Amino acid sequence: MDSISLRVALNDGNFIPVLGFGTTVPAKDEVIKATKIAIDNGFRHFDSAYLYEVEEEVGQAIRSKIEDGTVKREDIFYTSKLWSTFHRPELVRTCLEKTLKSTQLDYVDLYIIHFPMALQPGDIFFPRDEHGKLLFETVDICDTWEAMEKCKDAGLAKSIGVSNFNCRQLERILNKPGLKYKPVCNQVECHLYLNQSKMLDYCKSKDIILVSYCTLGSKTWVDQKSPVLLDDPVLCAIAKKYKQTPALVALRYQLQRGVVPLIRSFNAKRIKELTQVFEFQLASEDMKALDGLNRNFRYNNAKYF
Amino acid sequence: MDSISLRVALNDGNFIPVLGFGTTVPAKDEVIKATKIAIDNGFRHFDSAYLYEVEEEVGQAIRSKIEDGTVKREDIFYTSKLWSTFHRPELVRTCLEKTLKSTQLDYVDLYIIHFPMALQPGDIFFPRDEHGKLLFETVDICDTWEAMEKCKDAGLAKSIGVSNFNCRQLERILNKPGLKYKPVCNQVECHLYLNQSKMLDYCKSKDIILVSYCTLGSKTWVDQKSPVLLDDPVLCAIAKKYKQTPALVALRYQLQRGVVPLIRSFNAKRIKELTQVFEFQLASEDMKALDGLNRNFRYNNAKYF
Numbered sequence: 001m002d003s004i005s006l007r008v009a010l011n012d013g014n015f016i017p018v019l020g021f022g023t024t025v026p027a028k029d030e031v032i033k034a035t036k037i038a039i040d041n042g043f044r045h046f047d048s049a050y051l052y053e054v055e056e057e058v059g060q061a062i063r064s065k066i067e068d069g070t071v072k073r074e075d076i077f078y079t080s081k082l083w084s085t086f087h088r089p090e091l092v093r094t095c096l097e098k099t100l101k102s103t104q105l106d107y108v109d110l111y112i113i114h115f116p117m118a119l120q121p122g123d124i125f126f127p128r129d130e131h132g133k134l135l136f137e138t139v140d141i142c143d144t145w146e147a148m149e150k151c152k153d154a155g156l157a158k159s160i161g162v163s164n165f166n167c168r169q170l171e172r173i174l175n176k177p178g179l180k181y182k183p184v185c186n187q188v189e190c191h192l193y194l195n196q197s198k199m200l201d202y203c204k205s206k207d208i209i210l211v212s213y214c215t216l217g218s219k220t221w222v223d224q225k226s227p228v229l230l231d232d233p234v235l236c237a238i239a240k241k242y243k244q245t246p247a248l249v250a251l252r253y254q255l256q257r258g259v260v261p262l263i264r265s266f267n268a269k270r271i272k273e274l275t276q277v278f279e280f281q282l283a284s285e286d287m288k289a290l291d292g293l294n295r296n297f298r299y300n301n302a303k304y305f
Numbered sequence: 306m307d308s309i310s311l312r313v314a315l316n317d318g319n320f321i322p323v324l325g326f327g328t329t330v331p332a333k334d335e336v337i338k339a340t341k342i343a344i345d346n347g348f349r350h351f352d353s354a355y356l357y358e359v360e361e362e363v364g365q366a367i368r369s370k371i372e373d374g375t376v377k378r379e380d381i382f383y384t385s386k387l388w389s390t391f392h393r394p395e396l397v398r399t400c401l402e403k404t405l406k407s408t409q410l411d412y413v414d415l416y417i418i419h420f421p422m423a424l425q426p427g428d429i430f431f432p433r434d435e436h437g438k439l440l441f442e443t444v445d446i447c448d449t450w451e452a453m454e455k456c457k458d459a460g461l462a463k464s465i466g467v468s469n470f471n472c473r474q475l476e477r478i479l480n481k482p483g484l485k486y487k488p489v490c491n492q493v494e495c496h497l498y499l500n501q502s503k504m505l506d507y508c509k510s511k512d513i514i515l516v517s518y519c520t521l522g523s524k525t526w527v528d529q530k531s532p533v534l535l536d537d538p539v540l541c542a543i544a545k546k547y548k549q550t551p552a553l554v555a556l557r558y559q560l561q562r563g564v565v566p567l568i569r570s571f572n573a574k575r576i577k578e579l580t581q582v583f584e585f586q587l588a589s590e591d592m593k594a595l596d597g598l599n600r601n602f603r604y605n606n607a608k609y610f
């Protein structure tokens with residue numbers, strides 16, 4: 001409570017709280033209680049999406065705190081994402097309007113395209129053919145982007161950005177003739193093992209913020225790899241040295257390099273743990289040491305990449 | 306209520322209700338309410354497992370109905386499965402005892418080895434190296450089997466069987482010198498696209514019942530063939546002809562060929578739908594037609610095979 005709700009600038013004049021809180025269940029019912037505990041602890045940046053099927057639950061939690069006067073609408077930064085089946089220029093706002101109806105907020109502070117790939121419009125999140133294969137559809141991202149800009153103009157989304165865009169896809173938008181508004185962020189997976197320096201540097205020059213997910217490394221018989229990031233000896237070494245936890249040093253690392261981290265805990269003790277992230281600093285030797293962990297490993301829980 | 310709780314013989318003198326009900330969440334809290342609605346509708350065969358982490362919830366649901374006198378302990382057939390970390394002969398009963406403690410039942414009607422592979426004993430379901438790879442362990446299934454037989458002798462498990470065993474693994478048990486009790490079943494994935502005729506015929510000769518899961522066909526950008534079995538045109542054709550639903554014909558097909566199906570619905574209308582499965586019959590032309598769908602596709606949601 002206090003510093004983790006302080007803001008960083010967006011290229012459109014808006015500011016975003018420096019630490020975000022993800023809203024993804026693993027009972028929907030627990031989402032609302034976690035959001036409430038999070039808000040009481042200083043969190044002002046909530047990240048959800050159409051896909052998550054929990055925006056209703058997140059709205060109730062947010063509005064409970066507006067009602068009890070803990071927070072005002074303007075104190076909350078709420079992010080939502082456009083789902084793939086709604087990539088057609090005409091269906092973009094349909095998607096956003098469903099979010100606004102579900103959350104009961106008048107607008108969203110940040111609307112971002114969840115993925116660049118488009119899927120056929122329907123009532124299914126991931127539609128498939130007879131052989132159970134995804135029904136992709138070709139819709140030029142510049143067309144979806146234009147629809148996004150219309151959303152911002154209509155005042156339904158304060159800011160607009162993207163998520164999971166690579167260098168060429170990001171450039172495509174930036175070089176689209178008649179660009180009205182450029183993305184304010186690029187939400188990508190980023191952590192000690194997949195640090196995204198190229199992407200980060202590119203963003204800094206384009207004046208775009210990189211929002212990280214799977215920051216702390218995020219039951220089946222097969223997948224062979226997933227090293228548990230928080231068990232890393234170098235990390236545990238440096239945590240032990242600063243008398244911190246592996247998770248805080250991992251988070252502090254993202255903050256010091258200019259990334260707006262996304263975290264998520266449904267545990268009241270771990271939620272409070274995270275608010276102490278600004279209580280120390282990583283000395284450069286330690287920063288370089290951490291940069292060394294980059295082994296380019298992607299968890300890609302969504303099997304997208 | 307009435308016919309779906311009628312029993313079929315087991316090779317050890319016991320009988321098993323003809324239609325089973327699976328207990329796998331997708332809130333634990335909803336499991337107990339579904340089990341109760343299921344029991345009120347005639348279901349007497351409940352299938353759970355150590356792995357599911359819901360045996361406690363299933364016990365409360367079962368015992369609520371014993372208490373209200375709807376059902377007696379002897380009317381319920383409860384199945385549980387030995388988890389892989391408990392494959393060592395010494396840890397087998399530890400596993401079963403945890404189940405009995407968790408469910409508060411004096412014994413289980415059927416105890417089966419969930420998978421043939423063994424994993425190192427621990428407090429983790431799926432233990433992995435510092436490199437994200439499963440800690441397998443070699444324990445001869447005939448040794449685990451011997452431990453199982455001891456469970457039946459101790460009267461902790463009325464019947465014992467296996468799950469996910471292929472032809473050679475199944476034979477290994479059947480040919481183990483000094484076999485005391487042979488498995489009563491082999492719980493395997495079986496449905497219109499993966500019908501298991503070889504396995505079924507083998508079982509019929511060995512006098513072993515084949516219990517099916519993923520009967521009705523049971524997400525992600527994985528262009529991962531997830532053909533929706535209930536959307537199959539041939540199925541929908543034959544359903545339409547009998548004025549039934551795709552799901553009932555799919556279920557009736559398993560019943561007519563000698564399989565004890567496992568189903569699962571947390572929806573009170575679909576639970577009641579399923580009790581009407583014996584209200585019609587599939588004429589042989591239709592049976593052969595359905596047999597034709599066998600395209601050998603495995604959903605293997607557990608990524609085991």
Ligand SMILES: NC(=O)c1ccc[n+]([C@@H]2O[C@H](COP(=O)([O-])OP(=O)(O)OC[C@H]3O[C@@H](n4cnc5c(N)ncnc54)[C@H](OP(=O)(O)O)[C@@H]3O)[C@@H](O)[C@H]2O)c1
Nearest residue numbers: 022023024047213214215216217218247263264265266270
């Ligand atoms: N744009 C996209 O495509 C995309 C994709 C994935 C996620 N996201 C966003 O990112 C959010 C978080 O994603 P994620 O869960 O994958 O990221 P993550 O933060 O790396 O993983 C969350 C895990 O960290 C554990 N944890 C939390 N606080 C901790 C602490 N103090 N110490 C140790 N462990 C801690 C949590 O478990 P416990 O509760 O046990 O601590 C949880 O299992 C999502 O809700 C969503 O908002 C976006």
Ligand SMILES: NC(=O)c1ccc[n+]([C@@H]2O[C@H](COP(=O)([O-])OP(=O)(O)OC[C@H]3O[C@@H](n4cnc5c(N)ncnc54)[C@H](OP(=O)(O)O)[C@@H]3O)[C@@H](O)[C@H]2O)c1
Nearest residue numbers: 327328329352518519520521522523552568569570571575
């Ligand atoms: N031995 C093993 O390794 C193993 C592995 C997997 C499963 N199992 C057992 O099998 C049980 C069921 O497994 P499963 O869920 O994979 O099998 P499944 O029955 O093929 O899949 C269940 C799905 O069928 C839908 N459904 C249920 N009734 C329906 C109806 N009347 N009409 C149309 N759809 C219907 C349910 O959703 P709705 O609620 O929306 O209807 C649910 O999504 C498990 O709980 C477990 O007991 C064992």
